[PDB]
Amino acid sequence: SNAYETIDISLQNASASAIGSYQVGSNGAGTVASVAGTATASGIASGTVNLVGGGQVKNIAIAAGDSAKAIAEKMDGAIPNLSARARTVFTADVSG
Amino acid sequence: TAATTTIVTGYVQLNSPTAYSVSGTGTQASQVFGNASAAQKSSVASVDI
Amino acid sequence: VTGGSLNFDVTVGSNTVSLAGVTSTQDLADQLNSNSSKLGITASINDKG
Amino acid sequence: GSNSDADRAALQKEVAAQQAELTRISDTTTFGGRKLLDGSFGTTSFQVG
């Protein structure tokens, strides 16, 4: 019964065929990665990877030598509405 | 003469319905997601089921 | 956006948002809609644009 | 079950909506533009004699 006393609603922008997984995931946005999905000599290096989104801000640090599965679990969880997969599909050919 | 690159590591492509954003100091991010900066939409009409 | 995005921040009062990867209006829109929990400022993008 | 419902984000959204609704019930009680519970109540006294 007062001015500007309202209740907000945050209905979805649209639900057309443009809604889905807001996600590249790896190695496919702009340029491919250097260690992920690629054979390396030193492997995964140490450091952290900032993951901002959905209000909460995280700073999960990925140590060196960590397998892909390591990053898979670590980057998963805390961030609201986030899943994580992990695969190491590769080919080989013995010749020469 | 043996090679140098021997640690084969696959992709860590994750998934998120909402909008995320990934950044990292120096090469920490690029070695994992490359040039990837914020997110995508995936615009699912091209399912190619 | 000429070759890249706008990796900037938004200080909503006390706390500060750390968004990134802004290329179009939709990007900033979804980034605000997602972080709506933390930032005490509602976002409203009419589908007009 | 401490791990079974991954929709804890939607649950927190539900709880925040309930909290904002409670804050609204605090308001809108302006019996004379002088909202009883929230606002500014001076801990007054009614005359009877």
DSSP structure string for A3-49: TT--------S--STT-S-----SS-SSS--SSTTEEESS-SPP-B-
Check if the beta carbon of residue B36 is closer than 8 Å to that of residue A26: yes
**Is C23's Cβ below 8 Å from some Cβ in A?**
no
Gap from B25 CA to chain A (nearest CA, Å): 7
CA D42 to CA D36: how far, in whole Å?
A: 10
* Cβ-contact A49, A60 below 8 angstroms: yes
Please work out, in degrees rounded to the nearest 5, the angle formed at the alpha carbon of residue D10 by the alpha carbons of D9 and D13. 90
What distance in Å separates the CA atoms of residue B39 and residue A23, rounded to the nearest whole number?
5
For residue A58, give how far its alpha carbon lies from the nearest alpha carbon of chain C (Å): 11
> Contact A80/A55 with Cβ under 8 angstroms?
yes
Asked whether A54 and B18 are in contact (CB, 8 A), the reply is yes
CB spacing of A21 vs B21 below 8 angstroms: no
Cα C2 to Cα C4: distance, rounded to the nearest angstrom: 6
DSSP calls for C20-36: ----SHHHHHHHHHHGG
The set of chains that have 3 or more CB pairs under 8 A with A is B, C, D
Distance CA C8, CA C20 (A): 6
Contact D9, A81 (CB under 8 A): yes
Look at A55 and C42 and tell me if their CB atoms are within 8 Å. no
At C34, is the secondary structure helix, strand, or coil? helix
Of B12, B34, B27, the residue nearest A71 (C-alpha): B12
- Residue written as token pair 């909008």: B19
A40 backbone dihedrals φ, ψ, rounded to 5°? -135, 160
Greatest pairwise CA separation for chain B in angstroms: 50
Give resolution, Å, one decimal.
4.2
Structure determination technique employed: cryo-EM
A80 to chain D, minimum CA–CA distance in Å? 6
Cα four-point dihedral sign D3, A51, C22, B27: negative
DSSP single-letter state for residue A77: S
